[PDB]
Amino acid sequence: VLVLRGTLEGHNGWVTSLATSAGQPNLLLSASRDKTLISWKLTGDDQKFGVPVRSFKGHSHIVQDCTLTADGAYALSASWDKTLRLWDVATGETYQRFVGHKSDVMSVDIDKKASMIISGSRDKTIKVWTIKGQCLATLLGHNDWVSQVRVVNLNQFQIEADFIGHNSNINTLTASPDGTLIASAGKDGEIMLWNLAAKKAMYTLSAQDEVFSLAFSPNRYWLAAATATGIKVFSLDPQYLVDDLRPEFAGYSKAAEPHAVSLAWSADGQTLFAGYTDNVIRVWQVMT
Amino acid sequence: VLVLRGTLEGHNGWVTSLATSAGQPNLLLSASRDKTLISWKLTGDDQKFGVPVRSFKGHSHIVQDCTLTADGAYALSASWDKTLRLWDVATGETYQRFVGHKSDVMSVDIDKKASMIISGSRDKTIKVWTIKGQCLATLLGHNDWVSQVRVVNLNQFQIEADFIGHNSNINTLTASPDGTLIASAGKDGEIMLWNLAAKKAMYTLSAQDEVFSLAFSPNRYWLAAATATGIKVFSLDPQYLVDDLRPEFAGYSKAAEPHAVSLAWSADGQTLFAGYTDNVIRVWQVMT
Numbered sequence: 001v002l003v004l005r006g007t008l009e010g011h012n013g014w015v016t017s018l019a020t021s022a023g024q025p026n027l028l029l030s031a032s033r034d035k036t037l038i039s040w041k042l043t044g045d046d047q048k049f050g051v052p053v054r055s056f057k058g059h060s061h062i063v064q065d066c067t068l069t070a071d072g073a074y075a076l077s078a079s080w081d082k083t084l085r086l087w088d089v090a091t092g093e094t095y096q097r098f099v100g101h102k103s104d105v106m107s108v109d110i111d112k113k114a115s116m117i118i119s120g121s122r123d124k125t126i127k128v129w130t131i132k133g134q135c136l137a138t139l140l141g142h143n144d145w146v147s148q149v150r151v152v153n154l155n156q157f158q159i160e161a162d163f164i165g166h167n168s169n170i171n172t173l174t175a176s177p178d179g180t181l182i183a184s185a186g187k188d189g190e191i192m193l194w195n196l197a198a199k200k201a202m203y204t205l206s207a208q209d210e211v212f213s214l215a216f217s218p219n220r221y222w223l224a225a226a227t228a229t230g231i232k233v234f235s236l237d238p239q240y241l242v243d244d245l246r247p248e249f250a251g252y253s254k255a256a257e258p259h260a261v262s263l264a265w266s267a268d269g270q271t272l273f274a275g276y277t278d279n280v281i282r283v284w285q286v287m288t
Numbered sequence: 289v290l291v292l293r294g295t296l297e298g299h300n301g302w303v304t305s306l307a308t309s310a311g312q313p314n315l316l317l318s319a320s321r322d323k324t325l326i327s328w329k330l331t332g333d334d335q336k337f338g339v340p341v342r343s344f345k346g347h348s349h350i351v352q353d354c355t356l357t358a359d360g361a362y363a364l365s366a367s368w369d370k371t372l373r374l375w376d377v378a379t380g381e382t383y384q385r386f387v388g389h390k391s392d393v394m395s396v397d398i399d400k401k402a403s404m405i406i407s408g409s410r411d412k413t414i415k416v417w418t419i420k421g422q423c424l425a426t427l428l429g430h431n432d433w434v435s436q437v438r439v440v441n442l443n444q445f446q447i448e449a450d451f452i453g454h455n456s457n458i459n460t461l462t463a464s465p466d467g468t469l470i471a472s473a474g475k476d477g478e479i480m481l482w483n484l485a486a487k488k489a490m491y492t493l494s495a496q497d498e499v500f501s502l503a504f505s506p507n508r509y510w511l512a513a514a515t516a517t518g519i520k521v522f523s524l525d526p527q528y529l530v531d532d533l534r535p536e537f538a539g540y541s542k543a544a545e546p547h548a549v550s551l552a553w554s555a556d557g558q559t560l561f562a563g564y565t566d567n568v569i570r571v572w573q574v575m576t
Binding site: 134137138139141145155156157158162163164165166200 | 424425426427428429430433443444446450451452454487488489
C-alpha cells in the first residue's frame with residue numbers, strides 16, 4: 001500500500017543511487033550520472049517532500065552508487081572515474097579518495113563500526129579498504145558467480161565472502177539488513193533469492209521485466225525491485241506481490257516511460273525512494 | 289624429547305615439503321626441487337624407517353609444497369611451474385591440473401570435506417579451486433599482510449579469509465590443526481604468533497635464526513620450526529622451548545650445515561618429519 005508522496009527534482013542525469021541513514025532520518029542522499037551527489041533534507045510535507053541541501057561536486061564521471069554511515073555523518077561515492085570519495089555530509093569536503101580500481105566502480109559498503117570499505121567494480125572486482133584509502137583486499141570472483149563480501153588504525157581484521165553464482169546472474173544484488181538473506185537479478189526479472197544462514201536457494205521470483213535495483217525493507221519483510229515496468233514490491237511470507245509502483249508518466253509512450261534505477265528505504269521501512277531515468281527521485285509511503 | 293629415528297634418502301633436490309595423513313599413518317609424502325613427489329610407506333624400524341613407495345614425475349619445475357587428503361587417498365602438489373597437480377597416491381596419475389597462477393605457486397590446501405582447493409602463490413596471490421580445476425577465487429592481500437584463507441559439483445559455497453600483517457612478516461605460515469591459532473615467520477626467527485578466536489596477538493617467539501617452516505603438533509601443544517640453526521620445537525603453555533633438533537652434520541662447517549626446509553607431524557604428534565637442504569628427510573620421535 002505505497003502511495004506517491006512527491007518528487008525531489010534535483011539532478012541532471014539519472015539518479016543512479018539513493019542513500020538513507022538510521023542516524024539521520026532527517027536526511028537522504030543521491031548519486032547521479034551528473035557526476036554529483038546531493039544531500040536532501042526531508043521535511044514533513046505534501047508538496048516539497050524533500051529539499052536540496054547540499055551538492056558534492058568531486059567525481060570526473062558518473063557516480064554509480066552512494067551510501068551513508070550508520071549515524072549519517074559521512075557519505076560515500078562510487079564512480080565511473082573509478083574513484084571512491086569519502087565526504088563529510090555537513091561540508092561536502094572529500095576526506096580521502098580511494099584510488100584502486102581500473103574499472104568503473106559500481107558499489108560501496110561500510111562495516112557496522114565504520115572502519116572498513118567494500119568497493120565493487122564493474123569487472124566484478126571487489127576491493128576492501130581502510131577508511132584512510134589504503135587497499136587491502138582485491139578479491140576477484142568467477143564471472144558466473146555473485147559475491148557478498150562482509151567483515152567483522154587496526155593491525156588486525158577479519159573478512160568473509162560468500163559465493164553463489166549462476167551463468168545468468170547479472171550482477172545486481174543486495175542483502176537483508178541483518179545480511180541473512182540476499183537476492184540477485186538474473187535477466188527478464190528472474191530474481192534469484194537465497195538464504196545465507198540456510199546455505200541453500202530459496203525460491204526465485206519473477207519480475208518478467210529487466211530489473212535495476214533491489215532493496216529489502218528494514219521494517220517489512222519485503223523486497224523491492226526496479227523495472228522498466230516500474231517498481232515491484234514483493235512480500236516473502238506470504239510470497240505474494242505487494243505492489244507495482246507504476247507512475248502515470250504523463251505522455252510518454254506506453255513503452256518509453258522513464259524507469260527506476262535505484263531504490264532506498266527510509267530508516268524505518270515506511271518510506272521508499274527511487275531515482276529515475278529522468279533525473280528525479282520519486283518517493284512513496286506505506287500508508288495506514 | 290625428540291630422538292632421531294632415521295633418514296629417508298630419496299630426493300635429488302631439497303625436500304621442500306612433507307605431507308602425512310590421518311587416513312594412512314602408513315604413509316608419508318614429500319616434494320622436492322627435483323620436480324617430483326615421493327610417497328613413502330613407513331614401517332616400524334630402526335634402520336629403513338621408511339621406504340620409497342612411489343614417485344610422481346609431473347611438474348616441469350620445483351614442487352614447493354605437498355599435502356594429502358584427510359583419508360590419504362589423494363596427493364596435491366604446488367609448483368614453480370605455477371601448476372597444481374592432483375594425484376592418485378596409489379597410481380601416480382595426475383587427475384586435473386590447476387592452471388591459474390602466473391607466479392610460483394607456494395602452498396596448497398583442502399577443506400575438510402575434500403572439495404575445495406586453496407592455492408597460495410609467491411606474489412602472495414591466493415586462489416581457490418573446485419577439485420575439477422576451475423578457479424573461483426583470486427583474492428590478493430597487501431604485501432605487508434599475511435592471510436589465512438578458509439572455507440566451510442556445488443553451485444553454493446562460502447569462504448572466509450583472515451588478515452593480520454606486519455611490515456616484516458616473511459610469508460611463512462601455518463595454523464593450528466583446529467585452525468584456532470596461527471604463527472608467522474618474520475625475519476631473524478621472530479615468530480609472531482596469533483590467536484584466531486581471541487582476535488589479538490599472543491606473544492611473539494624468537495628463533496634468533498632464519499626460519500623455514502612452521503608446524504603445530506596435532507597431539508601436543510607444540511609449534512615446530514626449521515632454522516639454519518636446526519629445528520626448534522616450542523611448547524606454548526608453558527611457553528618454554530622443548531628442543532633444538534640439531535643433527536651432527538658429519539663434517540660440514542660449523543656454519544654450512546644443511547638445514548631443514550619443511551616439517552610434518554605424524555598423524556598423531558608422536559613423529560616429526562623434516563626435509564633438508566640435502567635431499568633427505570630426517571625423522572624424529574617423541575619418546576617415553
